[PDB]
Amino acid sequence: NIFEMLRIDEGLRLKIYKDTEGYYTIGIGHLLTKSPSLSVAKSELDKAIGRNSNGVITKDEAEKLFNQDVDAAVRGILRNAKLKPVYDSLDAVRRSALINMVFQMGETGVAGFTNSLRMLQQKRWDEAAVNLAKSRWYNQTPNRAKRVIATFRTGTWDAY
Amino acid sequence: MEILNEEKKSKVHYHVAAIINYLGHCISLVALLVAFVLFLRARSIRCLRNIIHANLIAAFILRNATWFVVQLTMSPEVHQSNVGWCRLVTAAYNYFHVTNFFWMFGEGCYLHTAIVLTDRLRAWMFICIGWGVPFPIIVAWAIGKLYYDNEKCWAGKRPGVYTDYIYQGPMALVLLINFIFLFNIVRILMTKLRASTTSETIQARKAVKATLVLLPLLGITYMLAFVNPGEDEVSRVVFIYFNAFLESFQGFFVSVFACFLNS
Ligand SMILES: COCCN(CCOC)c1nc(C)nc2c(-c3c(OC)cc(Br)cc3OC)c(C)nn12
């Protein structure tokens, strides 16, 4: 469901767009190239898509690119020494909510939530949800934060 | 004379058909209820899939419930009188009939999506299809009855009248699209997901076996509605009893189908 999870709170677009900083991206937030040329954005796309090189892609193609990013996010998690021990102790529904957080703030940001991580690693799921709500993240995107937090506390998909 | 004795022999068999229909509908209704309460007690009622199941069961409850009120409509003095509550009762039964088709399609949308893309929010689209799309279809049907066919409590059958296609045409269309989905699930299940053991895949296999059994069971009764068998005594009696047993136990069939999927 992780693809459904992130499609909900992050978003899904199937033709090439440009982000606030001006680079070429696609899908659930796949950056194609920092280069100004649109040409290279289509080519970098072609090597990934392994099909017709065009601005529009297949919704299935989006999930295969989404999978690629999910791969790199997990490689990043496992290299981080505060993030790694909490991840192995978590189950699958709780891992998705950890990845959800990294997609939003990077591995570096999730490492700032030092109390909540020791709570999650101790199975103290009710204590962790109070920690993560006393945070500027919860104030800035509350509707996403409440969904992610509930997944941590119950370990189910009921929220999405 | 002997004509009258033949007439009396047919009234008894119709009265027998009527008894089979009433008992099959009572058993179906209790069964759907027992399934409905079993689903609601489960803490797995938060799973999207069980949300879908509970709404299907509910949809078949309202239909079988209003079938009883419909029988009270079929009095011939009521039939000709065209009372307001009489047309309102007929549109209610038709609306619930359409929802049963759109909720069976809904289950087919979930299963094709669940095997291709890896809950309280996603369910609204299913509720929008199951209960929502039908409402404007019945409404358009009703305006068509009102301006063009305001008779027989809207339950009349008349030749050359296409008004009933407003709601019947949709029912066939979503069934066409569930057939493409079945062929794609089987196509996928047999090539790419041949060796998958992910939990969504085992569930998918259990459905496709079950759907293959329920489909002829539910499908027969719909083709029989076109047969027009004839006035032959032996062929007529068997036609009436088989068709009455299939329509009345239908909700019972569905409740077994639904509880089997709970596994
Ligand atoms: C012929 O009418 C049978 C009953 N019915 C309409 C009203 O129900 C009482 C219905 N309508 C729709 C629209 N689809 C289905 C399926 C089905 C499917 O058939 C292609 C594929 C797939 Br994939 C799933 C299905 O249902 C779970 C089944 C088994 N019955 N059915």
Residue numbers in the entry:
A (entry chain B): 1000 to 1159
B (entry chain A): 103 to 220, 224 to 368
Paper text:
We observed the crystal structure of the CRF1R/BMK-I-152 complex at a resolution of 2.75 Å using an XFEL. BMK-I-152, which is located in the hydrophobic network of the allosteric antagonist-binding site, binds via various hydrophobic interactions and a highly conserved Asn2835.50 hydrogen bond. The top portion, the exocyclic alkyl amino group, forms hydrophobic interactions with Phe1622.57, Asn2023.43, Phe2033.44, Gly3246.50, Tyr3276.53, Leu3236.49, Gln3557.49, and Val3597.53. We identified two hydrogen bonds (R1652.60–Q3357.49 and H1993.40–Y3276.53) in the central hydrogen-bond network. However, the stalk region in our structure adopts an alpha-helix form. The BMK-I-152 structure has an ~20% larger ligand surface area than the CRF1R/CP376395 complex and a higher binding free energy (−4.06 kcal/mol) than CP376395. Although BMK-I-152 exhibits highly potent binding activity (IC50 = 0.026 μM), its metabolic stability is poor because its dimethoxy groups are vulnerable to O-dealkylation. BMK-I-152 showed low liver microsomal stability (below 35% remaining) in almost all species because of the methoxy groups known for poor metabolic stability.
Corticotropin-releasing hormone receptor 1 (CRF1R), a class B secretin in the G protein-coupled receptor family, contains receptors involved in critical peptide hormone regulation, such as corticotropin-releasing factor (CRF)- and urocortin (UCN1)-activated CRF1R2. CRF1R regulates behavioral, endocrinal, immune, and autonomic responses to stress in humans and animals. We used the same CRF1R/CP37639513 complex construct, including the T4 lysozyme (T4L) insertion in intracellular loop 2 (ICL2), N- and C-terminal deletion, and 12 thermostabilization mutations, to obtain structural insight into the high-affinity ligand binding mode of CRF1R.
